[PDB]
Design an enzyme around this catalytic site. Structure first.
Site, PDB file in Angstrom:
ATOM      1  N   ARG A  88       0.816  -1.188   0.000  1.00 46.88           N
ATOM      2  CA  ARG A  88       0.000   0.000   0.000  1.00 46.88           C
ATOM      3  C   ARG A  88       0.873   1.269   0.000  1.00 46.88           C
ATOM      4  O   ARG A  88       0.576   2.244  -0.714  1.00 46.88           O
ATOM      5  CB  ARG A  88      -0.949   0.009   1.208  1.00 46.88           C
ATOM      6  CG  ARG A  88      -1.973  -1.153   1.225  1.00 46.88           C
ATOM      7  CD  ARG A  88      -3.182  -0.812   2.129  1.00 46.88           C
ATOM      8  NE  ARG A  88      -2.718  -0.531   3.479  1.00 46.88           N
ATOM      9  CZ  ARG A  88      -2.479  -1.459   4.389  1.00 46.88           C
ATOM     10  NH1 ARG A  88      -2.707  -2.743   4.123  1.00 46.88           N
ATOM     11  NH2 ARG A  88      -2.050  -1.106   5.583  1.00 46.88           N
TER      12      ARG A  88
ATOM     13  N   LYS B 131     -11.687  15.266   3.073  1.00 45.48           N
ATOM     14  CA  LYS B 131     -12.816  14.612   2.429  1.00 45.48           C
ATOM     15  C   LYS B 131     -13.570  13.727   3.404  1.00 45.48           C
ATOM     16  O   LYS B 131     -12.962  13.143   4.290  1.00 45.48           O
ATOM     17  CB  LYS B 131     -12.309  13.721   1.302  1.00 45.48           C
ATOM     18  CG  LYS B 131     -13.377  13.356   0.290  1.00 45.48           C
ATOM     19  CD  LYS B 131     -13.199  11.966  -0.267  1.00 45.48           C
ATOM     20  CE  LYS B 131     -13.627  10.865   0.715  1.00 45.48           C
ATOM     21  NZ  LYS B 131     -13.738   9.532   0.036  1.00 45.48           N
TER      22      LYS B 131
ATOM     23  N   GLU C  14     -18.846  14.398   0.023  1.00 42.55           N
ATOM     24  CA  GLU C  14     -19.074  13.407  -1.012  1.00 42.55           C
ATOM     25  C   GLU C  14     -20.370  12.610  -0.754  1.00 42.55           C
ATOM     26  O   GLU C  14     -20.351  11.576  -0.087  1.00 42.55           O
ATOM     27  CB  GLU C  14     -17.861  12.475  -1.118  1.00 42.55           C
ATOM     28  CG  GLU C  14     -18.009  11.361  -2.171  1.00 42.55           C
ATOM     29  CD  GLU C  14     -16.848  10.363  -2.164  1.00 42.55           C
ATOM     30  OE1 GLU C  14     -15.849  10.533  -1.412  1.00 42.55           O
ATOM     31  OE2 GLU C  14     -16.947   9.397  -2.931  1.00 42.55           O
TER      32      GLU C  14
ATOM     33  N   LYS D  26     -18.192  16.664  -4.036  1.00 40.58           N
ATOM     34  CA  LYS D  26     -17.777  15.494  -4.780  1.00 40.58           C
ATOM     35  C   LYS D  26     -18.973  14.599  -5.083  1.00 40.58           C
ATOM     36  O   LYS D  26     -19.504  13.924  -4.222  1.00 40.58           O
ATOM     37  CB  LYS D  26     -16.680  14.759  -4.045  1.00 40.58           C
ATOM     38  CG  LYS D  26     -16.302  13.516  -4.719  1.00 40.58           C
ATOM     39  CD  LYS D  26     -15.187  12.847  -3.990  1.00 40.58           C
ATOM     40  CE  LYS D  26     -14.768  11.628  -4.772  1.00 40.58           C
ATOM     41  NZ  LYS D  26     -13.738  10.946  -4.011  1.00 40.58           N
TER      42      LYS D  26
END
Lengths: 337, 337
Positions: free
Chosen positions: B49, B137, B178, B220
């Site tokens: 990752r 976010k 979002e 978003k």
């Protein structure tokens, strides 16, 4: 609705606000106009109300500054002294004709109000009396006290405005929605800012839930100011800043215009606030114009006073105030034409 | 927050979207990235990752197309193979750094979801780990079935997004909200249009009730399309028309930009929908850009496949896809530079 049907609504909205024009609201009920009449000694006869409207609509040159006029329903049945339907005075001048379609207010919860008239609105939109109308208006009124406007009242009124909007549009009428924040109350300007942002955003929620064609809706809004019973002072610039910020925060790009109500503010202040708001920077797509009754016609009433000898001077005041509001709708009130 | 504090938020929002730029979302949780890894045979180690993110962030020239990158929290603690903090790779390139601050989703009513993490959000905003972050976010997800999204779920998620937004802003972070409409469901495009208009308008209600600084919020959003399990077909133009109409109907002039999520759509389709929407006429103030993870990085994963020999080709695919998304954010994908 079909594509053409929607484009018509959009075009009508734009035609009303073209070239810095705005709306003359002449839609006062007999009761509302009667109270203004009585203050000045004018008797509240149908004849006097008819004559007032004729005085307004026959003003020479008004079409340069006025893109639409909101009529009261009784006025659609009325003729000039010369026998010409009052609506023909406006049609010949090329001014759009509108009909106020709410049936007033009733009590809601404690101390608040809702507007009424939806149950036969569809029927009334189709009436032959309003055949020449291409737009409409409907007013809700928000009282301010501690704890008020309540969230229930905001939701309910916004829902009524939105249902009115879609019914108008399905009938080929561009709706003006008027969520008026009542000036007569005790509240700070900050509080008015916050609540205006609650009302305008919730209104847009309800318009959207009803799938209203947003490019075919006009919003008739109060300036953000403190309440009349407050001892808080403001200036045109502070009103411009606060009102513009509220609108940039809540009104989608698709709305074609906001048309300010004068609301009990000066004619002078209502026009100076408009000019000030149009001088502010901040990208936006909608026009910022006016839909005034009092700001445009208080001076006519005061000058006229039920005396036909005073009419011309009354019309000249309307034309001069209309000019100022039009200049102010383009931010040009300080500039010489 | 004061005037300067607010202007900073606005400036940051604009800097992210400058010159047709958009956002690289690299914020996937270990679980979300793990599933994508396993499909391709790559083991889900922290090391893999870390390496993926380094592959992304060290891509030469990416700053021409990418104005900000959304990081997962674990990535703030991670270094490149060379010992350089991964955040320094982005700082040297002048790219804005963001932190995904939601802690995932839990069940809500029957079949639906809410996002969680508010109770220590203020604390986490102040963490030294996110000192270089200038935006954030938070994602909610709206499942579609018959009768769903429910009005309760819309309200609750919109309220969570708005509370997140104000907390971020009070901490000097520009929030991206979002409200994702989940592609994996059975629903028509018309239904998606209608529900998108419910969600976006209610979101703006809640942002306004929390007195969020609207010029400092990025939205978003999902493209308006039919659900994957529907047999309804659409094209880039129909998606552009429907999505733009939904946005013009609901998003205020003050919002600086909408940044589309790819949502399980093609990389190809996500970018072509962006280009198409930017070719549409319709006055608006906000930029229409992107915040893609999958659309930008699926190709990197597929090319790389845990094999360092493939890395350069992986980076070249990122740079090429980033270029296409940037061109598409200006409606210029058909035009040669």
């Amino acid at each position: 609705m079909d594509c053409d049907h929607l484009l018509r609504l959009g075009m009508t909205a734009k035609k009303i606000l073209e070239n810095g024009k705005g709306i003359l609201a002449a839609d006062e009920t007999p009761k509302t106009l009667g109270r203004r009449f009585e203050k000045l000694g004018i008797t509240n006869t149908e004849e006097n109300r008819r004559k007032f409207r004729e005085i307004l609509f026959s003003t020479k040159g008004i079409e340069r500054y006025i893109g639409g006029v909101i009529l009261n329903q009784e006025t659609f049945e009325q003729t000039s002294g010369s026998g010409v339907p009052l609506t023909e005075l406006l049609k010949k001048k090329g001014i759009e004709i509108g009909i106020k379609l709410d049936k007033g207010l009733i009590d809601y919860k404690e101390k608040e109000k809702i507007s009424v008239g939806l149950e036969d609105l569809d029927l009334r939109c189709k009436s032959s009396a309003f055949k020449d109308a291409t737009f409409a208006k409907w007013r809700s009124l928000f009282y301010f006290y501690d704890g008020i406007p309540s969230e229930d009242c905001i939701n309910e009124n916004c829902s009524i405005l939105a249902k009115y909007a879609i019914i108008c549009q399905k009938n080929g009428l561009v709706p003006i929605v008027e969520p008026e924040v009542f000036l007569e109350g005790d509240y700070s300007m900050k509080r008015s800012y916050e609540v205006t942002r609650q009302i305008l955003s919730t209104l847009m929620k309800y318009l959207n839930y009803e799938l209203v064609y947003i490019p075919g809706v006009l919003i008739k809004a109060s300036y953000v100011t403190s309440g009349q019973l407050s001892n808080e002072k403001y200036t045109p610039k502070k009103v411009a800043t606060f009102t513009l910020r509220a609108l940039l925060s809540t009104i989608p790009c698709g709305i074609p215009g906001i048309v300010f109500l004068s609301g009990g503010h000066g004619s002078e202040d209502a026009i100076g606030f408009l000019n000030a708001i149009n001088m502010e920077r901040g990208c936006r797509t909608w026009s910022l114009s006016f839909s005034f009754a009092r700001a445009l016609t208080d001076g006519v009433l005061e000058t006229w006073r039920g005396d036909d000898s005073n009419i011309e001077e009354a019309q000249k005041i309307l034309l001069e105030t209309s000019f100022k509001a039009c200049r102010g709708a383009e931010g040009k009130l300080w500039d010489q034409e």
